[PDB]
């Protein structure tokens, strides 16, 4: 192309969003999975591919051992992370990472190794002209187009809360909760053994992930929901497995997401999503707090339960004083927020100087990022 518009990769733990820089929607939304087949291949018909990264794994999941390369925001296996990125440019976008500049997001307080290796790989593997690393929550604020607010983003394995006032991070106040979507999925598996459905296989876990999205919804009052669910069959809901069996679910649909509000359930002693937002406000200075309580942005995937926005409001309200009324942004496209906001930052002028360049890296090595990025 005459104009090369830098790639925005929002590499998360659960998915791998990507696209060109010119739009408010990615082109490339495929779950970050490498499938390895787990039997002898008897037929000599075709030489089947040894590995099945990307959406193909979701179709062939029956005979595969699906694995996740990124757990808790952190890249446990790179060989698998390289395979996902090769698929991202060559197959998903059909573009060259050398004839295009590129920006990769990352959750805060990740071990310094993560940033370092990302920098090496973007320069040594795909030989990128220029690269950058950004924090998720700062970009989610860009998307909502507000200079000041507190951003609470929960994805699949990391939940983080970052408070910004008049375009100034207070980084002493940035809290992070491990509890996230994967912990919610894995708790539904554990409470569907109640009604006697077992999901031991990797692929079985992915079927559970799809029930949670279809039926799980947060409740204003947990106790009142529980009483009604026990009293009557109104709540009960029924889903068709891939075999053609039916599973019926009742109270389990509003207990999958309740763990967020009381991690006592999952076994952790973390306070809540509501107490984490509150406490990040209350580490900030007195004057800044009034503007923050007013603006509270929900971002990401596990912010997409119905009920969630109405539960947060009520929750923080009780914690806060009678004045300083709290309003929660909870936008419609919050699922792709982080990426859309990454679209803008690259689009925005004066971000050019900030871009790390091969030239700089060649002198100071991968450790360049530890001084040129936040
Ligand atoms: N409609 C939905 N309702 C509830 N949770 C959802 C929904 N869609 C996806 N999820 C959750 O969102 C996570 C993926 O969202 P996202 O934040 O975009 O990904 P990542 O953490 O990889 O960036 C999954 O773990 C899943 O639990
Ligand atoms: Mg995310």
Residue numbers in the entry: 1 to 374
Please give sentences taken from the publication describing this entry.
To assess the effect of N-terminal arginylation on the actin filament, we solved the structure of fully arginylated actin filaments by cryo-EM. Following this, using the helical reconstruction approach, we obtained a 3D map of the ADP-bound human R-β-actin to a resolution of 3.6 Å for the subunit. Local resolutions range from 2.2 Å for the core region to 3.6 Å for the flexible, solvent-exposed areas, including the DNase I–binding loop (D-loop) and N terminus. The refined map shows a helical twist of 166.8° and a rise of 28.1 Å, consistent with values reported previously. At the present resolution, we were able to reliably trace the backbone and resolve the density of the side chains of the larger residues and Mg2+- ADP. Compared with the core of the subunit, we observe a weaker backbone density for residues Met46 and Gly47 in the D-loop. The 2 N-terminal residues are not resolved in the electron density, indicating the N terminus is flexible. The structure of the arginylated human F-actin is consistent with previously published F-actin structures, including the recently published human β-actin structure. A comparison of the N-terminal residues shows the three negatively charged Asp residues in β-actin, and these negative charges are reduced by the removal of an aspartate and introduction of a positively charged arginine in R-actin. Despite the reduction in negative charge at the N terminus compared with acetylated actin, it appears the N-terminal arginylation does not help to stabilize the N terminus, at least in the ADP-bound structure.
